[PDB]
Design a binder for this molecule. Sequence first.
Ligand SMILES: [Ba+2]
Length: 113
Amino acid sequence: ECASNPCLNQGTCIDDVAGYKCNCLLPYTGATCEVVLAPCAPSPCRNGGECRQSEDYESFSCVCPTGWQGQTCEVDINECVLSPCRHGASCQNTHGGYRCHCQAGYSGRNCET
Ligand SMILES: [Ba+2]
């Protein structure tokens, strides 16, 4: 049976009494190695997170952009818990960001300049 080279994506074939079997090369899988393990294919990350597949292709992780957290980057980070706003400025936590309201004579994103 293996003389028909049925295993795709360069998997190796083994003749057996029941039927042949394919030893597939990750990330390929399935009866004839025709399926691709692709845990990032559904685009599971949110808010611009970068999906990264595991070494065994069974799972994913998300690398979240600044201000986001959670397994899929859906959870807001509250920068105001330890406020970065300088020179007396108030901190306002927003969805996906934060705002520093500067006291007189100060400016910049963190009221640093
Ligand atoms: Ba925020």
